[PDB]
Ligand binder design. Structure first.
Ligand code: ADP
Ligand code: ADP
Ligand code: PI
Ligand code: PI
Ligand code: NA
Ligand code: NA
Lengths: 230, 232
């Protein structure tokens, strides 16, 4: 479902060359639940961004759902992201002037597949907020009126909106207390097992990572090791 | 060193009045290390913001280092903040077009009354970054050129920059791996114990909270309970 082939991502600063990812190889099958761990700065977000088609590798190839994404133009890339990927951003990246509900509806507007009526769209957005454990009474808050953890749940709900086959979550429980975070992880487990979604979670919480079938560890931009869990 | 007396903070959302905090009473002694925990949305940030003079209660009194703050103006509160408080924001609140080093120099220079040399600006700021466990090679990166956890360490360093008597930290390890986070907490312990700094940390990590001598639990905007981690 996801393949990274000899992927490198470099940054140039002055005369210094930085390898955020260095010749990485990764193969995530359809319906797999995979967790990604490693020290702050090891390249975890870079990797997720590349999988999520939000950044392009400097060298290497990327395949999403059997589609080579490298040489695609932004129109095709936008389409692939919207169709294939639900992305939970580490810092949420909500639209400040839209309510929580509106933020979740936004992807449904541009699904570019089939049109929903307004009622159908609002109904789906609400279902996603409920799945993401956000109380309906917060649906009309704007992001600046929500706590960090409430915002995180809006970001989670938005990722689920278009019912994508692939969920990419960057530290999706960081702003949540243990109990609420556990509910989120049980949801990902359910979507993975019952709905066959491919799930990739970056995390610093070993307890979170343990929901995955395996844990991939990065270190200084390279895959250090993998631990099989099941 | 910090007192909240019958502090309430409300927000009006339509015809409904929401209580972020409700009739809370809190006394934090000089040099105490206190942790605050509680469910997402229970009022922790609001509490820390009020302690940090970043927001005012709707009702009640706040005292910082003996000074009553709840009736001060924006200008006046800023002067107290700059002198007495180092604040680590939950989402960092760094300045985008400044390097990590420059971000750290801001509060240093805003508080410092005199004229600090360009070379010594860099010197103190680098020392803050090192305490915050960020490698020197990242000093010249801008926030958008850093990972989340690297940004968090810049935010931590910035809180250190004014050598404040009070450090207030909102989930200061969330973006960090366990080992790096442990170092940050060890740093807080050292500042608290060796230098007598008053430290208040909001956290969802019980291991983090245990660095405190007390844990205050919030629920629905009120103090649910208190746990004393040292004898009395
Ligand atoms: N735009 C950039 N320019 C230079 N270096 C960058 C840039 N973006 C990220 N990096 C660096 O790449 C590394 C990996 O970051 P990621 O955000 O990829 O790390 P992680 O998610 O594991 O914490 C970091 O050391 C970071 O400083
Ligand atoms: N500007 C605001 N307008 C309306 N409600 C707010 C606003 N800011 C915070 N709140 C609400 O106050 C409550 C507590 O906020 P917060 O202090 O951020 O909780 P915590 O830090 O424990 O997650 C939340 O329910 C939140 O939605
Ligand atoms: O604030 P929070 O939601 O708890 O993170
Ligand atoms: O630093 P980080 O990215 O959070 O790991
Ligand atoms: Na990350
Ligand atoms: Na908060």
């Amino acid at each position: 479902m996801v393949k990274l082939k000899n992927v490198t991502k470099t940054y140039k600063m002055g005369e210094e060359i930085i390898y955020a990812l260095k010749n990485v190889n990764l193969n995530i099958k359809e319906g797999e639940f995979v967790s990604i761990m490693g020290p702050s700065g090891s390249g975890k977000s870079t990797m997720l961004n590349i999988i999520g088609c939000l950044d392009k590798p400097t060298e290497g190839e990327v395949y999403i759902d059997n589609i080579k994404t490298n040489d695609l133009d932004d129109d095709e890339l936008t389409k692939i992201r919207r169709d294939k990927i639900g992305f939970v951003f580490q810092q949420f990246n909500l639209i400040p002037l839209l309510t929580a509900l509106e933020n979740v509806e936004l992807p449904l507007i541009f699904k570019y597949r089939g049109a929903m009526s307004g009622e159908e769209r609002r109904k789906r957005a609400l279902e996603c907020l409920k799945m993401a454990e956000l109380e309906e009474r917060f649906a009309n808050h704007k992001p600046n009126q929500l706590s960090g953890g409430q915002q995180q749940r809006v970001a989670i709900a938005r990722a689920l909106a278009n019912n994508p086959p692939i969920i990419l979550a960057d530290q999706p429980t960081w702003a949540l207390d243990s109990k609420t975070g556990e509910k989120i992880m049980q949801l990902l487990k359910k979507l993975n097992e019952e709905d066959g979604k491919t799930v990739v979670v970056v995390t610093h919480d070993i307890n979170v990572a343990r929901f995955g079938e395996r844990i991939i560890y990065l270190k200084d931009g390279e895959v250090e090791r993998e631990e099989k869990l099941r």
